[PDB]
Amino acid sequence: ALKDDAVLIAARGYVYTAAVGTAAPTPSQLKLIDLEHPEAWDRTGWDLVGHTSEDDLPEFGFDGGDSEVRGSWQKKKLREVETEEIADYVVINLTQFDETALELYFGPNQSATPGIFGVKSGSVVNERALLIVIVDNDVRLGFHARKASLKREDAISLATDEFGALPVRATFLDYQSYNLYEWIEEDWFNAVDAPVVYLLDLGGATGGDYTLLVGGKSTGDIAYNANASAIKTAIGAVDDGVAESAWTVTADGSDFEISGPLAVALGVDSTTGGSGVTVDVV
Amino acid sequence: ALKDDAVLIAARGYVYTAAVGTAAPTPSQLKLIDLEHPEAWDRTGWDLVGHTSEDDLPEFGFDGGDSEVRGSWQKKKLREVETEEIADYVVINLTQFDETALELYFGPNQSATPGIFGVKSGSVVNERALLIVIVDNDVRLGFHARKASLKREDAISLATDEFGALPVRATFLDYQSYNLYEWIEEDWFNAVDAPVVYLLDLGGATGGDYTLLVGGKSTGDIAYNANASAIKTAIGAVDDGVAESAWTVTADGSDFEISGPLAVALGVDSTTGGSGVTVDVV
Amino acid sequence: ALKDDAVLIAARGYVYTAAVGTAAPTPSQLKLIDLEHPEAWDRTGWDLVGHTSEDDLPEFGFDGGDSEVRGSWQKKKLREVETEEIADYVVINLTQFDETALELYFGPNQSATPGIFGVKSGSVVNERALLIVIVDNDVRLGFHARKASLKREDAISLATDEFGALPVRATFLDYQSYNLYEWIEEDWFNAVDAPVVYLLDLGGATGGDYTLLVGGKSTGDIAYNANASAIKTAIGAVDDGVAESAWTVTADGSDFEISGPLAVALGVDSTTGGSGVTVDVV
Amino acid sequence: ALKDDAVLIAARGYVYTAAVGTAAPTPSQLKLIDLEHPEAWDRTGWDLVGHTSEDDLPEFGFDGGDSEVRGSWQKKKLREVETEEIADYVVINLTQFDETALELYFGPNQSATPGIFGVKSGSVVNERALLIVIVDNDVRLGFHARKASLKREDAISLATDEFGALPVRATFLDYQSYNLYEWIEEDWFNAVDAPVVYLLDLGGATGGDYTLLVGGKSTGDIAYNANASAIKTAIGAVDDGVAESAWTVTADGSDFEISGPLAVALGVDSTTGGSGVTVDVV
Amino acid sequence: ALKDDAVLIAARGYVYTAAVGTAAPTPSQLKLIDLEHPEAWDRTGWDLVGHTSEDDLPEFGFDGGDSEVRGSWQKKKLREVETEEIADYVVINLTQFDETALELYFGPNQSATPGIFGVKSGSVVNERALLIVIVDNDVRLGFHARKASLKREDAISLATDEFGALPVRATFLDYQSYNLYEWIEEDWFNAVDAPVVYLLDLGGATGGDYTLLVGGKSTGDIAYNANASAIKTAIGAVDDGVAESAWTVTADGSDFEISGPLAVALGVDSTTGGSGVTVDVV
């Protein structure tokens, strides 16, 4: 279904890392968590990766994944076969230059003396857990990987007016029978299939009649004191392809549930009392 | 011929998916369905895939089709032959981060937990039927594939001022006896030579209780010596998608002419017997 | 051989198609035919492909034609060879989504059902004749191929703010003893060597004198009373590489028709009232 | 048609806001409303925005809408296309500096303490429903929008001569099933298309004759006791060819009434007794 | 050459619309129609657009039309070309706010309820035919666009001291091989020449058999044409708005000559006395 609440702009976001395997905040915690302070979290061990580029948001790419359509002499297209496997990564453009951000790009500090960061000959291993939180007016698309192997992706960028940047690629590694990686919103994933209810209210009406509008098409006159079976009858009697048995209607005085296969609204109202009729959605 | 009705401009459109092999709404239904609610339709089983990007529309690409002109020593240019056969697809840029629209990009949820969606490996099988309805003015060009294999086309896009995108390539695969895919629009493809008319008999009968069928559904019942308006309003049955204003009827007292946007058939023949009744195309 | 009328701009134009081998309008008919009604022509069998994009006109490309020069130890750089045979084509961007334009891009309709256009796996032949008429402001350069093989050249283009398009490539194939393709225009292919001639009016102005500007050199003064031989030797007097044997001068009664190796223009007029002196092409 | 009372001068007016989606008063019960008091209206939830400026009235602008005329190589001037979607908005200038004016412009108060309105780093979402009323001599055109995104349009004005003001732009946006905004006035939109009728009242006549006129043209004398068909014949008999069959005529009280495609009036009158003949629209 | 009649001043005017393709009144009707009542004309169904700004007269602008001069390496100036085709339009400042004006600004009314006018998005199509009649000294330069696509030009204008306005642009489009617009005036655009005459030749004739077409309808019966000029007070009495003084008539022996503002056509009188009366143009 088309949901307008789940279309996402990445307007601000945060990136965290920890020793491999650490649990991210649970999907109920992630909406209450304070993002700038990993020292305050109930899921301890996360810490911030430092500032990250506004121009270069994390690129959730892949490499490999080529495939060909194959078939017999008889039927030319019957399976699509992978030539080589997908491998999954994210590219992160760090911009802070502390040890806390050079360590992801170069690997662990190779010298112990104060005020320097030392580097050795190549092929160091730098596996780390990764958490990312993309935040849009307090909707929070969370992403977590139990293990990722980090490597530098391209040269260190410098400029005279833009920020310098340390582009690092995290490649996702399968860890200890956990998932490869994982997305964390309470309201969007494995959520309960609750049908839409139009919450009609007669609003203190007295005398006269009103008309429902369903799928953009209008029913007849509904009396200010009509019952649930009559309302269900009048919606089902709209010339619009769905039977009466497709609908439900349930009552509490002025309050009604209406629910079924199409959108419901109000056309004309002449019910001469209170606010007149209204229609909310649950 | 040149026609100005058929220069498509595709300003809005809806993308739907279903389990492999499910049929689309027919050419005469496509002109009448409510597009935003797939649970209302005849030809059930479709689900709306969610928001699709307004700039990166579905691209109907193909790979292969490499072709060479050939001929023998005596006759230099006699055939054009395909060195590689046409592997055929449509690329949809989904822009919604629900389970309903990640499932096409990553395969099924792979975890039990409420509020989480997980990933395991690069390889998955994700085969679906596809329907696209492309709308401008009143023309609604449909496109239907009985079986398509879905894979991710490239990286998840993110930006600070434009919606994040989940691009999937649907690649078409051959499904038993059926076409690889069908374009659907009643006004254009296989169009009838002249606007169709159906005959109906009163035939010198008596007593004359009978029932019609339109759009696969039975009318209200019709009596002896019925007026053209009485037949027209009985054909205007509220089980259908079509208003009485769209139908037309005419008569010679013995015989009737009927015409409109759906086919007419005899639902139940005249209960009194006698000379009986029939219905057919003129 | 500079001819400004023959410098073509394709500002408007038409594309037609018919069963293989069908004959185009003769060059003398091509000036008379009504280009939007092929049903009316003296050459029966043509019909239009429908609308074509304005931005992307027919592209008369070719593939192959690679060649090299080769020799022997006996004899250096002996002969050229064409190492693969040149393969002409034209690409037409159709824009109707009607059956009359889907059938060129997808081959024949694979479904008998009214309102749908089925497509199937594998190769489809779709050989047919082609006629194109390019209409530069009342000159009509036609082009005809008695057999072309039509294949889809690229993806269907869809956009929200520009007409959708179906690129078809028509490769040209040899048919019987006929040419591969022909350009048809009565004025300027295989036409007569029409003489270029100048008319010196002299239609009044009894008294006074004028020069003539020949090849951009002025001759001296000549009087209104002059005869054909006097005009000839005055034209022949200039320094510029030509003499009285190269020129011709003739008269329609004090009104001179002249020809030769160089252009002639009015130079300077000083004749009496009456506006007689003027020179221009026949 | 020309309607001299549908020409609007925006001499006075009022502006109101509410939570997203709340209904405005219906047009029946917009005539009765007390506009200074948005408490105790027909439909509740509205609040007054405060004093809007007296010279810089609300302006119903829009952004985008650049459209271009598309074509084809065969025929140009096919359908026109919008290259940008029209973004309707209204700009309102508020002369008040109280919290009810500042929370439209800055978004909600960022401070809890009495007697201050603290504000903070921007990007604040401020969606609101909007109602505007224009008042002109007892006709009262209203306007209503279900959702608008309010934002600051330009700098705050201050001066020593005339009141300061805050400019705010309300961009209209879609909100579920409903229209973008709706104009409200009872006698104008969707009102019954009733034809014009003229009463011809004989004013207490006792004898004599009179000339009627139509479209500025007179007709021959009508007796004080002429019947409906006689006057219908005589008014239909004039030069201009609006013949008898174009006219409807009726009678009661010994008077007559006329209706038809041209306006009617009284010319010369010789009728004895009473006021003489009388005629006007009824 | 110059004349002072054709120096238009546009002191008053009218603007009309209708369904696409309908025909304006002919040049000889436009001189005698009554402009305020489109239901009276018997040309077709036009409707009057309502009041228009009394000082923002219609602006017949255009977009595009840019041009430059092309050449060659030999010759620098050989033809002028236009890089964009002329996109013609007219801008009309409507000023009444009734539905008959708002339909042209916002497109057709999207709300079904009494007293509410609604709108939802761009990509609406609002094709109409357009007629403008520009009046001074009762000369009437008409203008007629066969198909025009109306859109809003800029914002609704509201003011405290002069009328509000609804600026619409109508862009002219090609319809079905007609002119994209026409200017209509019988005295100016063609046949600026001595007035047309029709000759009737009586032949061999007897008796009061009669019929004579003028303006498409028969004149009333006349006895044997037996008196000179006696066709006056019949022509100029059954005349559709052009009385006796408009008609100039002469007769001698077998010959009657007739001239005036509307065409005389076929007639046949006094049959069986010989060859009968006959008619032709001079």
DSSP secondary structure string for all residues of C7-25: ----SSEEEEEESTTPPPP
Q: Which residues of E101-115 are buried (b: 16+ CB within 10 A; e: fewer)?
A: bbbbbbbebbbebeb
> How far is residue B181's CA from residue D147's CA, in Å, rounded to a whole number?
41
Angle at B264 between CA B263 and CA B268, to 5 degrees: 145
HEC string for E79-128: EEEECCCCEEEEEEEECECCHHHHHHHHCCCCCCCCCEEEECCCCCCCEE
Phi, psi of A104 (to 5 degrees): -70, -40
How many angstroms separate the most distant Cα atoms in chain A? 89
Interchain proximity C102–B189, CB inside 8 Å: yes
DSSP class per residue in B216-236: TEEEEEE-TT--HHHHHHHHS
Contacts of A75 in chain C (CB under 8 A): 121
- Residue B130 in tokens: 């596809």
Nearest Cα residue to E33 out of E180, E272, E240, E251: E240
> How far is residue B82's CA from residue C218's CA, in Å, rounded to a whole number?
68
Interchain proximity D123–A278, CB inside 8 Å: no
Query: What DSSP designation does B155 have?
Result: P
H helical segments located in D178-274? 228-236
Contacts of A74 in chain C (CB under 8 A): none
Closest residue in E to A217 (Cα–Cα): E112
- A126 neighbors A107 (Cβ within 8 angstroms): yes
- C172 neighbors C132 (Cβ within 8 angstroms): no
Residues 6+ apart with CB under 8 A from E136: E8, E9, E10, E11, E12
Provide the sign of the torsion angle of the four alpha carbons A254, A255, A260, A266, taken in this order: positive
Nearest Cα residue to D147 out of D167, D176, D185: D176
Phi, psi of A181 (to 5 degrees): -165, 175
Q: Which of D44, D123, D178 sits opposite A275 (nearest CB)?
A: D44
Bridge partner list, C19: none
> How far is residue D60's CA from residue B37's CA, in Å, rounded to a whole number?
34
H helical segments located in B42-195? 99-106
> Using beta carbons and an 8 Å cutoff, which residues of D are at the interface with A?
23, 26, 42-44, 123, 125, 176-178
Neighbouring C-beta atoms of residue B78, cutoff 10 Å: 13
- E112 neighbors A218 (Cβ within 8 angstroms): yes
Residue with tokens 């068909």: D229
Interchain proximity B9–D78, CB inside 8 Å: no
Amino acid at C95: T
End-to-end, the C-alpha distance of chain A in Å comes to: 16
Phi, psi of C228 (to 5 degrees): -55, -45
Nearest Cα residue to E118 out of A278, D129, D145, B11: D145
- Residue D182 in tokens: 């709706």
- A38 neighbors A78 (Cβ within 8 angstroms): no
Neighbouring C-beta atoms of residue A38, cutoff 10 Å: 20
Determine if residue B207 is left, alpha or beta; phi over 0 gives left, psi from -120 to 50 gives alpha, anything else beta: left
- A229 neighbors B155 (Cβ within 8 angstroms): no
- Residue A126 in tokens: 């730098």
- E239 neighbors E217 (Cβ within 8 angstroms): no
Residues 6+ apart with CB under 8 A from D238: D214, D217, D219
Amino acid at A192: V
Taking the CA of residue A263 and the nearest CA in chain B, the distance in Å comes to 8
Taking the CA of residue D89 and the nearest CA in chain C, the distance in Å comes to 23
> How far is residue C120's CA from residue A80's CA, in Å, rounded to a whole number?
17
Closest residue in B to C156 (Cα–Cα): B60
> How far is residue E156's CA from residue A76's CA, in Å, rounded to a whole number?
61
Nearest Cα residue to E75 out of C1, C187, C141, C268: C1
Q: Which of A58, A78, A240 sits opposite B158 (nearest CB)?
A: A58
Contacts of E99 in chain D (CB under 8 A): 188-191
> How far is residue E225's CA from residue D83's CA, in Å, rounded to a whole number?
68
CA E199 to chain CA centroid, Å, is 28
Q: What element of type H or E holds C230? A: helix C228-236
Interchain proximity B161–A6, CB inside 8 Å: no
Burial class (CB in 10 A: 0-12, 13-18, 19+), C282: exposed
Cα torsion through E37, E41, E45, E46, rounded to 10: -50
Q: Which of C115, C161, C174 sits opposite B184 (nearest CB)?
A: C115
Taking the CA of residue D3 and the nearest CA in chain B, the distance in Å comes to 32
Nearest Cα residue to A14 out of A43, A46, A60, A61: A46
Bridge partner list, B4: none
Q: What element of type H or E holds D13? A: strand D12-18
Q: Which of B1, B85, B190 sits opposite C113 (nearest CB)?
A: B190
> How far is residue E91's CA from residue E113's CA, in Å, rounded to a whole number?
31
3-state SS, residue A40: helix
Nearest Cα residue to B30 out of B113, B141, B159, B196: B141
Nearest Cα residue to B226 out of B242, B210, B215, B246: B210
Q: Which of A275, A277, A279 to mutate to test the interface with D (most CBs of D within 10 A)?
A: A275
Residue with tokens 């209302």: B40
Bridge partner list, D209: D223
Burial class (CB in 10 A: 0-12, 13-18, 19+), A67: middle
Contacts of D26 in chain A (CB under 8 A): 269, 276
3-state SS, residue C235: helix
Angle at D53 between CA D48 and CA D54, to 5 degrees: 120
> How far is residue A178's CA from residue B112's CA, in Å, rounded to a whole number?
13
Break-preceding residues in chain B (C–N over 2.5 Å): none
> How far is residue D60's CA from residue D88's CA, in Å, rounded to a whole number?
7
Amino acid at C250: T
Phi, psi of E100 (to 5 degrees): -60, -20
DSSP class per residue in B161-183: SS--BEEEEEEE---TTS-SEEE
Neighbouring C-beta atoms of residue A39, cutoff 10 Å: 10
Cα torsion through B264, B267, B273, B274, rounded to 10: 10
Q: Which of C2, C9, C36 sits opposite E74 (nearest CB)?
A: C2
Neighbouring C-beta atoms of residue C114, cutoff 10 Å: 14
Interchain proximity C51–D73, CB inside 8 Å: yes
Taking the CA of residue B191 and the nearest CA in chain A, the distance in Å comes to 25
Q: Which of D72, D75, D81 sits opposite B9 (nearest CB)?
A: D81
Nearest Cα residue to C255 out of C197, C198, C201: C201
Residue with tokens 């309808």: E217
Phi, psi of A91 (to 5 degrees): -105, 125
- Residue B108 in tokens: 């099924």
Nearest Cα residue to B107 out of B88, B93, B127, B89: B127
> How far is residue E168's CA from residue E170's CA, in Å, rounded to a whole number?
7
Nearest Cα residue to E37 out of D267, D259, D266: D259
- Residue D231 in tokens: 């006057």
B–E CB contacts, 8 A cutoff, strictly below: 4
Q: Which chains touch A (3 or more CB pairs under 8 A)?
A: B, C, D, E
Provide the sign of the torsion angle of the four alpha carbons E191, E194, E195, E198, taken in this order: negative
Q: What element of type H or E holds E141? A: strand E139-152
Contacts of E123 in chain B (CB under 8 A): 11-12, 136
- Residue E230 in tokens: 């006696």
> How far is residue D12's CA from residue D7's CA, in Å, rounded to a whole number?
15
> How far is residue C3's CA from residue E281's CA, in Å, rounded to a whole number?
49
Interchain proximity B2–D74, CB inside 8 Å: yes
Amino acid at E235: I
3-state SS, residue C35: coil
- B47 neighbors B40 (Cβ within 8 angstroms): no
- Residue D1 in tokens: 């048609």
DSSP class per residue in E162-230: S--BEEEEEEE---TTS-S-EEE-TTTSS--SSPP-EEEE--S--SS---EEETTEEPPP-STT-STTT
- C168 neighbors C152 (Cβ within 8 angstroms): yes
How many angstroms separate the most distant Cα atoms in chain D? 88
Q: Which of E120, E123, E147, E149 to mutate to test the interface with B (most CBs of B within 10 A)?
A: E123
> How far is residue D205's CA from residue D200's CA, in Å, rounded to a whole number?
12
- Residue A241 in tokens: 């392809």
Q: Which of B117, B173, B238 sits opposite A239 (nearest CB)?
A: B238
Provide the sign of the torsion angle of the four alpha carbons A123, A126, A127, A131, taken in this order: negative
3-state SS, residue E234: strand
- Residue D82 in tokens: 């919008």
Resolution for this experimental structure (Å) = 4.0
> How far is residue A129's CA from residue A127's CA, in Å, rounded to a whole number?
7
Of the CA atoms within 13 Å of residue E19, those in its CB half-sphere come to: 2
Phi, psi of E27 (to 5 degrees): -55, -35
> How far is residue C173's CA from residue C148's CA, in Å, rounded to a whole number?
6
Residues 6+ apart with CB under 8 A from D171: D87, D88, D89, D148, D149, D151
3-state SS, residue E9: coil
End-to-end, the C-alpha distance of chain E in Å comes to: 27
> How far is residue D79's CA from residue B69's CA, in Å, rounded to a whole number?
40
Neighbouring C-beta atoms of residue D141, cutoff 10 Å: 23
Contacts of E112 in chain D (CB under 8 A): 190
Residues 6+ apart with CB under 8 A from E121: D85, D86, D174, D180
> How far is residue A110's CA from residue A103's CA, in Å, rounded to a whole number?
10
- Residue C17 in tokens: 């198609």
Interchain proximity B11–E123, CB inside 8 Å: yes
Residues 6+ apart with CB under 8 A from E238: E214, E217, E218, E219, E220
Phi, psi of D48 (to 5 degrees): -70, 135
Query: What DSSP designation does E27 have?
Result: H
How many angstroms separate the most distant Cα atoms in chain E? 83
Closest residue in B to D176 (Cα–Cα): B36
3-state SS, residue D231: helix
Nearest Cα residue to B270 out of B179, B183, B208, B198: B208
Amino acid at E265: A
Closest residue in D to B54 (Cα–Cα): D85
> How far is residue B221's CA from residue B226's CA, in Å, rounded to a whole number?
11
Closest residue in C to D83 (Cα–Cα): C161
Provide the sign of the torsion angle of the four alpha carbons B219, B222, B226, B230, taken in this order: negative
Interchain proximity A218–E114, CB inside 8 Å: no
Neighbouring C-beta atoms of residue B112, cutoff 10 Å: 8
Residue with tokens 């019909």: C47
Taking the CA of residue A115 and the nearest CA in chain B, the distance in Å comes to 36
> How far is residue A124's CA from residue C208's CA, in Å, rounded to a whole number?
105
Amino acid at A249: V
Residues 6+ apart with CB under 8 A from B47: A1, B16, B17, B18, B38, B100
CA A35 to chain CA centroid, Å, is 17
Cα torsion through E95, E98, E99, E105, rounded to 10: 20
Q: Which chains touch B (3 or more CB pairs under 8 A)?
A: A, C, D, E
Nearest Cα residue to C33 out of C137, C142, C189: C142
H helical segments located in chain B? 27-30, 99-106, 228-235
Cα torsion through A224, A230, A233, A239, rounded to 10: -20
DSSP class per residue in E63-77: E---EEEE--SS-S-
Closest residue in B to D80 (Cα–Cα): B9
> How far is residue A119's CA from residue A110's CA, in Å, rounded to a whole number?
6
Contacts of D43 in chain A (CB under 8 A): 275-276
- Residue E99 in tokens: 């539905």
Q: What element of type H or E holds A259? A: strand A255-259
Burial class (CB in 10 A: 0-12, 13-18, 19+), C32: exposed
> Using beta carbons and an 8 Å cutoff, which residues of E are at the interface with A?
112-114
> How far is residue B24's CA from residue B43's CA, in Å, rounded to a whole number?
6
Pairing of strands D198-201, D278-281: antiparallel
Residues 6+ apart with CB under 8 A from A141: A8, A10, A133, A134, A135, A183, A185, B97
Q: Which of C120, C121, C123, C124 to mutate to test the interface with A (most CBs of A within 10 A)?
A: C121
Pairing of strands C222-223, C209-210: antiparallel
- B282 neighbors B274 (Cβ within 8 angstroms): no
Closest residue in C to B89 (Cα–Cα): C155
Q: Which chains touch E (3 or more CB pairs under 8 A)?
A: A, B, C, D
Closest residue in B to A85 (Cα–Cα): B122
Interchain proximity E159–D10, CB inside 8 Å: yes
- D187 neighbors D194 (Cβ within 8 angstroms): no
- A80 neighbors A67 (Cβ within 8 angstroms): yes
Taking the CA of residue E112 and the nearest CA in chain A, the distance in Å comes to 8
Q: Which residues of B229-261 are buried (b: 16+ CB within 10 A; e: fewer)?
A: eebbebbbbebbbbeeeebebeeeeeebebebb
Contacts of D77 in chain E (CB under 8 A): 172-174, 180
Neighbouring C-beta atoms of residue C125, cutoff 10 Å: 11
Residue with tokens 């019954």: D192
Pairing of strands C198-200, C209-210: unpaired
